[PDB]
Design a protein around this nucleic acid. Structure first.
Ligand SMILES: [Zn+2]
Ligand SMILES: [Zn+2]
Ligand SMILES: [Zn+2]
Lengths: 100, 69, 1186, 144
RNA sequence: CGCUUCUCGGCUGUAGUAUCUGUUCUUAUCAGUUUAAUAUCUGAU
């Protein structure tokens, strides 16, 4: 996300598995986290979509509900043509809140 | 760091003149042979055929500016 | 301002060509890529022509194109790699006639980048995978399969990334149902960029690498990696499995090598050079095409060297090893980008410069006479393989497909005194260069022309039976007499045809299956084949003014306008209907629809009258002679014609205006175009196996359908009077048309194109030409790097003859030197010799632009190359013309080291027909831009702009400037101003003063451009085009005072920075811009002629309602109708600079090419109806251009 | 629809980007980003070139929020006014003596380069040859 | 259940920055580290 600056994306080669977003994350652009003008579907790589990891939220890791999307300002800047936008690590937020 | 390993041609705070210009020349050569019509224009300016111009460009992308310094 | 881009002539030069069963039938098709345009061509087997079936603008640059067949499949899908970061797999749907995009997979950012793939494209020959590859660092492998709906599916992209690696070519190695392998010519360059000695980059040989996709392990591994003893440029697949020795041929400079891994010893065979062709000081020879062929017994390759010498390459082999590779000189064809040899024995060559060709292979194999060559013949001393070239022996030319690429210079001018203007175009590279004249008309080929006495007012043409394939009678009606001619292929007047038209006639036809009718204003004569004259007299003393004839209906109108019907019975006689009507005025015209095949009478009848009204009347027997709907007209009707292909009524008036209505039991819309100052006469003509309508005015036009799209195009021919259809063995399908005192059997052979190309061939690549405005003649400078002038051709020929006598002629044959001397090879056919490097042939040719003959030819020296020409007339001397020619000397183009130029001054003495030398001034750099200015000339030396004036010894400078940057390439003046085009930066405005002689820079532009050519539009604005593809318009700010007399600049430049008011991407290097008016009755429009053959226009918008409507149309079409390659259309037009104030009309004119649900969606989003949107969408084109 | 309201709010952001408190500058830089991507391809490349003149001095800020807001604004103006204009701004700071300006100008050039690498080919400056190496792209320089 | 009188009331956690207030070196050279350049740091009189 852009709010949490320590989160890193997968950025490997994007396959054919369409990325999904959870119920808490619905409407968000993957890169921006803005809610308006979705234009392009999210294709996550094959390691980020394997077995138990299928149908899972791109940002969270929770159970996916809807399809994921890039906004139009990610489409026209071509931020959808870098890699798999699956946020890999869970770092320094929603972990100490679990510990609180 | 990770950009210049992954996306070639980027450059950093210590990029000399030769490295910047050799990335300039390699991107210029791939855009010459990529566009059809720049290759048309460079084939009219000689009498070389298009495959002669593409071989001449492709053999120059190895060391286009000269030996390093 | 707001512009609008239309393409009149689409691009014609071909970069890629592939072949295969794209329709899914037994016959094969070509699919070509014209850079921005993807077309499908069908090579018609019986008649040998090529017919375009579909032409789509993909709005990208198709960097590679390849067709592949799914395993156990009939259809071949097309695989497109482009400047978008997407592979896209297409399928030709022949039913809907479109390229349905099957698949589209994204892998990286867009544009012709160095890292992302798309440039190279290999496919497995079985059809199980596809590898799309970059020039550096990264490749991708898709795995294609077919799932249970017989539907194509792709896997995720595999990766085969290898850092610091150049890829010269990639190709699919055949392995029959084995793990698929791809071969590529890589090169690792990191040790070549680490060592400053410069020799480590001199021993860094290519590597043939084999990538093997493991379908079991789902990844790509480098299997084999073997170095190469010379740099190969591209590879050829060898078929394998059960067919042949599976491997990859490797072409290279002076060598062809079979290489295949595992056990084969590497087989080299040196390329056969010509016998003693005079172009090789030190120059090698590479292959440029592949053209594999698999004739179901053996397989061979039609390779082609860089001169054009097709070799037939064949492998002689044991069990699976190759024993030897052997080849022989197949033929010689102009140099091609791609060849597609077709099963059914055709060979299609796509010459990259000039016309493309389709040959029929006459003697394949060619295993009879010629000294064939082989790898295993133990020959030393270099090549020692010396074939002698010869004219065509194995191929015969069947079709020449026309093209204009490369358009190097163009003028819009009316030198031929025609009403419409003309396009005078330079074309070609090398000895195939040609000046082409283009008009808007259709090509009118005179099969036969006869003179007729008197003054004939009508003609008709009839057969004897309906089953007659050709005609048997021609009928000519003069003012007071008629004649009947007969065609026994030797046309003669006859007397016993049965007509006997002593009175003039109004019509004839073949009414019966074998029975005829004459209609004359004194009676109606049914003439059965057995010559039985059914005469019918006039009722009373009215005479028959008009008539409408059919197969099974006749309707005449007599004076006062009384309508009489006649039906053809199943008995075959004519029966008058028992109701007669006289209409509200006289009848000026009447017409009936042609009878359908199943139907037995024609339903509707249109009658035009003196009230300027046309009435439609049904003639079904329930309501015969009863009106349906009327239409008012502005002027007197003259002629009506009703056709289908969906019925249309075409109305030509007494002024030169044509209209069309749609037809049904009610009439519908209206379309119109001014054909014209003459009463328009309309005639049904059979054209291209369909119906077409010939309109007659001061110029004759033809309206004909072409894939549900009517083209109302004129005919490049004189004004005529009357016209009708024609068929014979002399002409299978033509027109019989009469003008003043004469008769013409003509044929319109080409019904596809827009322009009539007529070419006059030139010696070298013509740079630019000027127009001597008194007694119009073109003055062309032609200049080619790497080319001998023919004085040194003759000198080198005599020198090689002297050597062929002197080299041990004792034992003898000096016949060899003589026959070498006096047997020229046609350089337009066999390719010009290339004169090493830094040599420069050049001529100056004054040419009549009517007949196309060299009215004068002036050679130059060996390296003195012409670059800029101007005709002018000075003020210090009198009226006499002058020609200036900028010349250079020892120019060598890379690394750029000119040795100082000259400016030749000639006189253009006489009417302009010859060219006397006057003087020769030397200048210290190449004068690339000469321009007349206020009775003097302005010469751009290159960084130095000098005024010049005539002296009797040499040209004398009057001023100079030195602050203009890198290199001048264009000088254009509006009067008192100079627009100096830099070769890198931009337009630099310069003021010239009268009191002083200064040249003061007073404005420049902020962008860098690389301007090629430019054009003035207003006193302020300059439209320019650049090397990369764009078109900009630079308008000066409203103040920008010129009064600057003479240190800081503004940003290292001038002070009044000009501003840009459009930027637009075209996709080709636009090399000629001109403000003109292509159609009289139209308005001005910036015509651009690109380098890939295309011709377009940029037209302004009148009002904001038009501009806003077309903006919303194309803003909807970017959404509903995306381009084929996936390249975003806004981000294609905004390739280099972002787009500004230009609406792409090639996307707008794809509104007529969608399915009607999409058109209804967009049109209701526009709150109009789709015929009104298509009317509004073609109104701009017909108003501004063709 | 930002083609209609950009001339109304350009005198607002020109006042916000001159203000001392850097939250004004980070939020006005975000407005410049979204407005630049909203009027792409409509011919409003003059107002954005005006606002770039005020956005560009905030390059040397080191608060992370304002540096990512200004750098998002720069890579959102790259598509609006062109890679040529952003390369003219990024030039002559690429080889500045201080590392503190050299690395910021090199990372804005990296954003331009990976944003549009093909379009930069026409826009590169002409760099003359030194003794041992040749640097003039001669192929673009010659003319038919 | 109904009738009357009096009186009262209402109408947190997380990532990050910009500021004050607190306190600090008239060391002369030299050399090295370092910086855009000072500064800073390290030693011998
Ligand atoms: Zn986004
Ligand atoms: Zn991933
Ligand atoms: Zn979520």
């Amino acid at each position: 996300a852009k709010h949490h600056p320590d989160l890193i994306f997968c950025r490997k080669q994007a396959g054919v598995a369409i990325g999904r977003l959870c119920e808490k994350c619905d409407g968000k652009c993957v890169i921006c986290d803005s809610y308006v003008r979705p234009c392009t579907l999210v294709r996550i790589c094959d390691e980020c979509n394997y077995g138990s990891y299928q149908g899972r939220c791109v940002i969270c890791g929770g159970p996916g509900v809807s399809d994921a999307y890039y906004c139009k300002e990610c489409t026209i800047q071509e931020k959808d043509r870098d890699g798999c936008p699956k946020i890999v690590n869970l770092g320094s937020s929603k972990t100490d809140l679990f510990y609180e | 760091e990770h950009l210049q390993s992954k996306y070639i041609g980027t450059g950093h705070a210590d990029t000399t003149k030769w490295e910047w210009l050799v990335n300039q020349h390699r991107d210029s050569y791939c855009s010459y042979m990529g566009h059809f019509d720049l290759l048309n224009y460079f084939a009219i300016a000689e009498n070389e055929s298009k495959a002669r111009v593409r071989f001449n460009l492709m053999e120059k992308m190895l060391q286009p500016c000269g030996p390093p310094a | 301002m707001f512009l609008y881009n239309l393409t009149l002539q689409r691009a014609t030069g071909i970069s890629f060509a592939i072949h295969g069963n794209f329709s899914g039938t037994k016959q094969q098709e070509i699919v070509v890529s014209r850079g921005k345009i993807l077309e499908l061509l069908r090579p018609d087997p019986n008649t040998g022509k090529v017919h375009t079936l579909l032409t789509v603008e993909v709005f990208g640059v198709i960097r590679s194109l390849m067709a592949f067949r799914l395993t156990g499949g009939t259809k071949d899908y097309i695989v497109v790699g482009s400047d978008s970061g997407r592979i896209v797999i297409l399928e030709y749907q022949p039913s809907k006639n479109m390229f349905e995009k099957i698949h589209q997979e994204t892998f990286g950012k867009s544009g012709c980048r160095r890292i992302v793939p798309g440039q190279f494209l290999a496919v497995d020959p079985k059809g199980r995978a596809v590898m799309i590859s970059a020039i550096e660092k990264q490749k991708l492998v898709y795995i294609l399969n077919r799932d249970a709906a017989a539907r194509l599916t792709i896997s995720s992209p595999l990766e085969a990334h290898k850092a610091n690696t150049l890829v010269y070519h990639v190709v699919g190695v055949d392995v029959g149902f084995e793990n698929p392998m791809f071969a590529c010519l890589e090169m690792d360059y990191e040790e070549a960029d680490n060592d400053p000695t410069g020799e480590a980059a001199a021993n860094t040989q290519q590597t043939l690498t084999f990538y093997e996709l493991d379908l079991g392990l789902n990844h790509v591994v480098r299997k084999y990696s073997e170095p190469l003893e010379e740099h190969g440029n591209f590879l050829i697949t060898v078929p394998g499995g059960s067919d042949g020795p599976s491997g990859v041929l490797i072409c290279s400079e002076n060598y062809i090598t079979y290489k295949n891994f595992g056990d084969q010893p590497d087989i080299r065979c040196p390329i056969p050079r010509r016998r003693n062709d005079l172009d090789d000081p030190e120059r090698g020879m590479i292959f440029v095409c592949s053209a594999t062929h698999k004739t179901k017994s053996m397989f061979f390759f039609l390779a082609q060297t860089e001169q054009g010498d097709i070799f037939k390459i064949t492998l002689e082999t044991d069990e699976d090893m190759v024993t030897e590779i052997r080849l022989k000189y197949f033929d010689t064809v102009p140099v091609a980008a791609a060849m597609c040899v077709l099963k059914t024995g055709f060979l299609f060559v796509a010459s990259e410069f000039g016309n493309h060709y389709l040959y029929q292979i006459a003697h394949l194999g060619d295993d009879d006479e010629e000294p064939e060559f082989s790898s295993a013949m133990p020959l030393e001393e270099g090549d020692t393989f010396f074939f002698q070239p010869r004219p065509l022996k194995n191929l015969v030319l069947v079709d020449e497909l026309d093209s204009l690429s490369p358009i190097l210079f163009c003028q819009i001018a009316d030198l031929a005194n025609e009403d419409t203007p003309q396009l005078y175009v330079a074309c070609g590279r090398g000895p195939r260069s040609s000046l082409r004249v283009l008009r808007h008309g259709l090509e009118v080929s005179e099969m036969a022309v006869s003179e007729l006495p008197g003054n004939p007012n009508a003609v008709w043409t009839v057969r004897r039976h309906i089953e007659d394939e050709f005609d048997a009678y021609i009928i000519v009606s003069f003012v007071n007499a008629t004649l009947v001619l007969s065609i026994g292929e030797t046309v003669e007047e006859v007397t016993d045809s049965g007509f006997l038209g002593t009175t003039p006639t109004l019509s004839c036809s073949l009414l019966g299956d074998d029975a005829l009718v004459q209609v004359y204003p004194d009676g109606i004569r049914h003439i059965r084949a057995d010559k039985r004259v059914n005469e019918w007299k006039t009722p009373g003393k009215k005479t028959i003014v008009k008539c409408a004839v059919n197969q099974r209906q006749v309707v005449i109108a007599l004076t006062g306008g009384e309508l009489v019907y006649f039906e053809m019975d199943p008995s075959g006689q004519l029966n008058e209907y028992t109701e007669r009507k006289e209409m509200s005025a006289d009848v000026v015209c009447m017409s009936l629809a042609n009878v359908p095949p199943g139907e037995q009478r024609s339903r509707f009848l249109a009658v035009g009258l003196v009230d300027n009204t046309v009435r439609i009347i049904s003639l079904d027997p329930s309501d015969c002679l009863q009106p349906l709907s009327m239409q008012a007209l502005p002027a007197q009707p003259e002629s009506l014609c009703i056709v289908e292909m969906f019925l249309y009524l075409n109305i030509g008036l007494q002024n030169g205006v044509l209209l069309r209505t749609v037809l049904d039991p009610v009439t519908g819309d209206l379309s119109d175009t001014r054909t014209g100052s003459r009463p328009v006469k309309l005639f049904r003509v059979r054209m291209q196996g369909q119906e077409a309508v010939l309109a007659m005015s001061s110029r004759s036009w033809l309206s004909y359908s072409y894939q549900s799209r009517f083209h109302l195009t004129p005919l490049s021919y004189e004004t005529l009077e009357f016209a009708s259809g024609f068929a014979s063995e002399q002409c299978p399908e033509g027109i019989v048309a009469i003008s003043t005192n004469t008769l013409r059997i003509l044929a319109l052979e080409k019904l596809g194109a827009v322009f009539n190309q007529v070419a006059f061939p030139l010696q070298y690549t013509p740079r630019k030409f000027v127009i001597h405005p008194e007694s119009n003649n073109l003055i062309i400078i032609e200049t080619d790097h790497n080319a001998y002038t023919e004085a040194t051709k003759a000198q080198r020929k005599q020198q090689m003859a002297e050597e062929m006598v002197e080299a041990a002629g004792e034992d003898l044959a000096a016949e060899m030197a003589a026959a070498f001397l006096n047997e020229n090879l046609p350089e337009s056919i066999f390719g010009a010799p290339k004169a090493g490097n830094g040599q420069w042939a050049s001529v100056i040719r004054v040419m009549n632009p009517i007949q196309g003959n060299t009215l004068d030819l002036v050679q130059l020296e060996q390296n003195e190359a012409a670059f800029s020409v101007a005709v002018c007339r000075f003020s210090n001397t009198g009226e006499d013309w002058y020609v200036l020619v900028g010349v250079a000397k020892d120019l060598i183009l890379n690394p750029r080291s000119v040795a100082g130029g000259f400016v030749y001054t000639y006189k253009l003495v006489n009417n302009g027909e010859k060219l006397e030398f006057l003087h020769k001034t030397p200048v210290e750099e190449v004068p690339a831009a000469i321009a007349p200015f206020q009775g003097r000339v302005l010469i751009g030396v290159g960084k130095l702009l000098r005024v010049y004036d005539l002296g009797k010894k040499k040209l004398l400078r009057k001023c100079e400037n030195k602050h203009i940057a890198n290199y001048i390439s264009g000088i254009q003046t509006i009067g008192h101003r100079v627009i100096v085009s830099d070769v890198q930066e931009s337009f630099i405005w310069v003021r010239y003063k009268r009191n002083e002689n200064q040249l003061i820079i007073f404005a420049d532009d902020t962008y860098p451009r690389w301007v090629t050519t430019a054009s003035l539009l207003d006193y302020d604005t300059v439209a320019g085009a650049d090397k990369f593809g764009n078109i900009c318009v630079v308008r000066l700010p409203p103040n920008t005072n010129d009064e600057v007399d003479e240190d800081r600049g503004l940003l290292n430049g001038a002070s009044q920075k000009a501003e840009v008011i459009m930027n637009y991407h075209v996709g080709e290097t636009v090399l000629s811009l001109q403000k003109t008016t292509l159609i009289p009755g139209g308005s001005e429009s910036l015509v651009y002629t690109t380098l890939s053959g295309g011709i377009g226009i940029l037209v302004p918008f009148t009002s904001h309602e038009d501009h806003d409507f077309f903006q919303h149309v194309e803003m909807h079409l970017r959404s509903e109708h995306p381009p084929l390659c996936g390249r975003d259309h806004l981000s294609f037009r905004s390739y280099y600079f972002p787009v500004k104030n230009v609406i792409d009309g090639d996307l707008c004119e794809q509104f007529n090419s969608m399915e009607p649900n999409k058109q209804k969606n967009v049109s209701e989003e526009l709150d109009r109806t789709p015929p009104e949107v298509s009317k509004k969408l073609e109104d701009i084109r017909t108003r501004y251009a063709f | 629809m930002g083609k209609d309201y950009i001339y109304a709010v350009t005198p607002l952001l020109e006042d916000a980007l001159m203000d001392r408190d850097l939250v004004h500058r980070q939020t006005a830089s975000a407005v410049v980003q979204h407005m630049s991507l909203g009027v792409y391809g409509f011919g409003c490349e003059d107002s954005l070139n005006h606002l770039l003149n005020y956005v560009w001095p905030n390059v040397f800020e080191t608060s992370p929020h304002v540096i990512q807001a200004v750098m998002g604004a720069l890579e959102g103006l790259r598509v609006a006014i062109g890679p040529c204009r952003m390369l003219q701004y990024c030039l002559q700071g690429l080889f500045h003596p201080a590392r503190k300006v050299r690395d910021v100008y090199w990372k804005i050039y990296n954003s331009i380069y990976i944003g549009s690498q093909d379009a930069l080919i026409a826009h590169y400056p002409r760099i003359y040859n030194d003794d041992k190496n040749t640097y003039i792209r001669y192929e673009l320089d010659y003319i038919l």
